[model samples]
Target: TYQTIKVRFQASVCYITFHRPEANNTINDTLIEECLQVLNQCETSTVTVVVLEGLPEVFCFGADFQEIYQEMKRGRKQASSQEPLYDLWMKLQTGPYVTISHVRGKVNAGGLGFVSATDIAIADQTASFSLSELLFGLYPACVLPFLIRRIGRQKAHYMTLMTKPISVQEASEWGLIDAFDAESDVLLRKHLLRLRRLNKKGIAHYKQFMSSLDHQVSRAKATALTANQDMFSDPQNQMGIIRYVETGQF
Candidate 1:
């Protein structure tokens, strides 16, 4: 239904799948735009819940390193793409529908932002998550706000600073994810059924009330934009990113 993403709606649920398999489902301009478009569609459609996922081997690898290299080389650090991208995550955070990230494979960088913003997240055994920005001399700027919200400041701080992938078990312990198992389909089905039975208005009310509890999240997202811009524009960090991309290390 959309380029860079596939969307399907059934029984009040909207399934949004990332489709940039060739690029490891990296978040690029088109991917970000298309994701936002689909979420916008859900806001007005009969779809009451949104389920996001990716391919088996990889969920999302965060920012497109190739795009980062090309854009930052020309002095376009944050890219015009991320402006809407940040807001889109917030939309998922407080939007009317109950959002769930059915994660598997590798989830990293900006991908973690999606996991954090979702109301519920259930992942399989193969799923692994990381915030590798610090490894490249860059801060996990945009991801920090959402990440901290999901797992709290101290745990989030450790994960970002460590710059290593955490297992699904740890992600669950840190409160980053709700459930994990090699066989997660049964649990996923249960949550889907529960969300399906929820009335749209009830979901809206709960989200609206919860919105006031985490009002600063939106502010943090705004602040992160400038932070990301600064880091991405830095020559040293850009070099680090280039080196990492080339060597496939860190």
Candidate 2:
């Protein structure tokens, strides 16, 4: 359970945990590949709900900046990993799988992507979150699409640009997490049980119809397009991540 996440499916439910805790569950090419593998399995597998968790004490710190920056230095803007990682996200959005993010402790940047992609999300009251991209002179690419959808453009702009870590309480206001509780497992189980009660046929239709409303795109388009939706250009804000490094700020 590492740089690549592992999955366990039981009783029509799937649990996928991010194990790259060495970097606080950060994503690189490896994580992307494993995620794709899991998604492929979910194709025929009867997994309706996927619980996304992290390693001890934290969810994820977000994108592996050190790795991305190294690539940038070599004139490669994006890491040549597993295509547009964002596509995997969109696939998750359209896939039969209903994602549930079980967030706790530290969650930042790319970590928020996991939170945003899920069909449902709940976080620990004490967990912290942020979007730290510009400080490293890189914008949050391949992630802004769904992220902007989850919390709205204004809040997404503020959070993504400001790169400030917000408390779980504030996160709820942002509409990122559905519920904030100290006991994530209990709440998750309750939701899972409720889901289990639904007829699988109804679950699939209900998910498709509702998600269509949220995305407002053709099912085919949502199922396809790989590149992340963003107005690619310069950094929105650039001081935060640098400030943190200069002084352990956020």
Candidate 3:
């Protein structure tokens, strides 16, 4: 099991939670599929707001690198996969719901992808964010395109190469977080109030319009960005991570 995705519907709001307390909510293959499933289910759901929140003191540990690395060590070839999560982001951009990432704890790698894929993000003071995919001989391309849109190409590139954790405040300066707080709920409530006053159709229209213009550039950048990540995940390069892990960083 990757983690639990909780769904709640309350008058135009679809509250979703990532529930996997153990190991601080590290992600695996199953979690990826399940998250997509939740997104798919929401296609027909009536709610207009999608809030993706996480467990307390532990937002996520990103991808399960150890699991994937071990698989690499076995000479197992990477499996064919669906398109980059960008398709889902495109869906969220055009869909009826207003997506939000509510962070309460650590979030790294692909978890960052989840946050960046949404339309809005609210982070708490206790949250931690990082992109540490380099260690696993993989790249964050699976989620990198959306990230560049959220923060910018500069911030996203620095984050990936540096592979260091940044404070929520710093992230806010970079524009990944729309709001940061000791009490995000209050601000989030304020957002809901603001949303309730506007026309949902208009909101979706603008969200999609903005995304459409940006995607013109973002899509090309995504293609180049993933080119690097694709090489990293290739059969030969994938083994580099396995060797390093086995040899203790030598």
Candidate 4:
């Protein structure tokens, strides 16, 4: 039903597969909108759970560099309009149905945002996670809001500052993901079966009940959009991006 992604329905679960392997499943404008549309569909459908996944070898590498580099070259800042990804993440975070990320491979930067925003995140033992924005001379300011909500301030700060890929084991320990064991799939299936036994309206009711009590965090679209624009406006960052594409150094 989508272009950049494929959706399969089995029982009450919606399995969303990112099919842009040619682009390493990098998050772009299209992927953002398509994923958002799928989530919106959940609002009206019988689907109780949404599972987001990528190719077996790569989940998502973060924002598309080709798009970013071009956007910068054209000297354009972020739009004052609402940020779509922020809206998507916000809905996933505070919505009625459960959103889960079934990660099996590499994850970075904005990809981390999707993981954190979801209600539950389960990664395979071989999956790796990182926050690599600093290497590009750009701050992952937009991701910080959701990342901090999952991992707390100090640890989230460490991940971005280190800019190193951490094993799924370490990520699980730090609470970036709910689990990173071989049994994650087993657990997911078991939980989905249990969830299937509950009333969908009741599930959504409980989510609405708890969302108001969630810890206060700045997931504001305006704040994130401005921070994004500010980073790209820096000449050093632009040069860093060019260097990354040319010589693998930022």
- On TM-score, the candidate that comes out on top is 1
**Model 4 steric clash pairs:** none
Best by lDDT: 1
Query: What's the TM for model 3?
Result: 0.83
lDDT of 3 by residue, 1-250 (tens): 3346666667877777777666467765555567677666666665567787865876666656566676766775644342545455556655766788888787887677777777888887988888766655556766777778788889989888888989998889998888979998897888887776665577667777777676543555457455755665576566666676567543
Candidate 2 on 46-157: residue-level lDDT in tens? Answer: 7777788864577777667555445644675422532346667766776776778888888776777677878888877778877766555555555566677778789878
- lDDT: worst 10-residue window of model 2: 224-233
Q: Order of all candidates by lDDT, from best down to worst?
A: 1, 4, 3, 2
Error of 4 at 179 (Å): 2.1
User: What TM-score should be assigned to candidate 1?
Assistant: 0.93
Model 1 residue 219 CA deviation (Å) reads 1.8
Between candidates 1 and 4, the one scoring higher on TM-score is 1
**Best to worst by TM-score, what's the order?**
1, 4, 3, 2
lDDT of 4 at 156: 86
What are the TM-scores, per candidate, against the unseen true structure? 0.93, 0.79, 0.83, 0.91
Show model 3 residue runs off by greater than 4 Å: 1-3, 73-75, 79-84, 135-137, 216-229, 232-236, 244-247
Q: lDDT tens digits, residues 51-102, model 1? A: 9986587777788778777775677735453677788788888888999988
Off by over 4 Å in 1: 72-81, 247-250
Deviation in Å, model 4, residue 27 alpha carbon: 0.9
**Can you tell me which runs of candidate 4 are displaced by over 4 Å?**
72-82, 215-220, 248-250
- Determine which window of 10 residues in candidate 1 has minimal summed lDDT: 72-81
The per-prediction tally of clashing pairs is 0, 0, 0, 0
